[PDB]
Design a protein around this ligand. Sequence first.
Ligand SMILES: N#Cc1cnn2c(Nc3ccc4c(c3)CC(=O)N4)cc(Cl)nc12
Ligand SMILES: N#Cc1cnn2c(Nc3ccc4c(c3)CC(=O)N4)cc(Cl)nc12
Ligand SMILES: [Cl-]
Ligand SMILES: [Cl-]
Lengths: 123, 123, 4, 4
Amino acid sequence: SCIQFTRHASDVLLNLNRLRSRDILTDVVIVVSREQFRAHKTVLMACSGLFYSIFTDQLKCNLSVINLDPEINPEGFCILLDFMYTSRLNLREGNIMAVMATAMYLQMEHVVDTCRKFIKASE
Amino acid sequence: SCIQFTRHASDVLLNLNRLRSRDILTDVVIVVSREQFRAHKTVLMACSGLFYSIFTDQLKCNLSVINLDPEINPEGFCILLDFMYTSRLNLREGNIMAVMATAMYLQMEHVVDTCRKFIKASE
Amino acid sequence: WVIP
Amino acid sequence: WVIP
Ligand SMILES: N#Cc1cnn2c(Nc3ccc4c(c3)CC(=O)N4)cc(Cl)nc12
Ligand SMILES: N#Cc1cnn2c(Nc3ccc4c(c3)CC(=O)N4)cc(Cl)nc12
Ligand SMILES: [Cl-]
Ligand SMILES: [Cl-]
C-alpha cells in the first residue's frame, strides 16, 4: 500500500554527484595510468560488475587505492564515471571504441549494449 | 550531446538498498531511543537536510554513532529510512502523525508535503 | 507522488 | 536510452 515519489532516485543521484564534486566522503582513488579519480565505493559497486566483485572481496574492500589494467583509457573511464553519477553518457565518434572497451572491462552491460548498437548503425 | 539511460538512477538506488540489507560499507548507526539503524552517510545526506548538515560538520562527519532527539519515533524513522533507499513511503492512518513529525525533524520537505495533503483530506 |  |  506504499506511495512513491517519482523523482526521488534522480534527486539521490544528483546529491551523490554533488558529494563527488566536493570530494565529500569519497573513500577510494581509481588509478588509470597517469590519472586519478576519487569516488564512493558504494556508487562504483552499484554501477559496475567489476567494482561489485572487487569491493565484496574481504581484502580489497579495505583498499584506498585501486589500479586498473594499463590498457584502460583514462578518458573512457572518466566518461563512464560521469555516467555512473548522472545517468548521462557522453558517447562520441572519437571516443566510442574506448568507452565500449572500458564498459566491457567494468562490466556495465547497458553501456556495452548501446555502444554495440551505435557501432552497428555506422557499418 | 549526451544520451541518457532512463532506469539508471532507480537501478543505482536498488543496489544501494541491497548494500544496506547485507550491511556492506555502512559507516553509521542511527540510534532512535532503544532502536539502532545502520546506514550509509552519503545516502542519509542525499535524502535529508538534517543529515546533510550533520555529516558536513568537520567533527560530526567522523562519528560512527548519531543519537536522534528522544521525541523521535523509531517506527517513523524506519519508514523514512526505507523511503530514502527505495522511493516508497509506507504512509498509513496509524503512522502518518509520527511520519510527518520525523520528516519535519529530518528536513525531508517532499514527505512533509504529502503528509500535510493526506491529513488535510481527512479533516 | 504516485500509486506504484 | 533517450535524448534527454
Ligand atoms: N549488496 C549489493 C550490491 C551492490 N552492487 N550490486 C550489484 N552491482 C552490479 C553487479 C553487476 C552489474 C552491475 C551492477 C551493472 C552491470 O551491468 N552488471 C549487483 C548486486 Cl546483485 N548486488 C549489489
Ligand atoms: N555535496 C553534497 C550534498 C549531499 N547531500 N546534499 C543535499 N542534501 C539535502 C539537503 C536538504 C534537503 C534534502 C537533501 C532533502 C530535503 O527535503 N531537504 C543538498 C545539497 Cl545542496 N548538496 C548535497
Ligand atoms: Cl550500465
Ligand atoms: Cl523528501
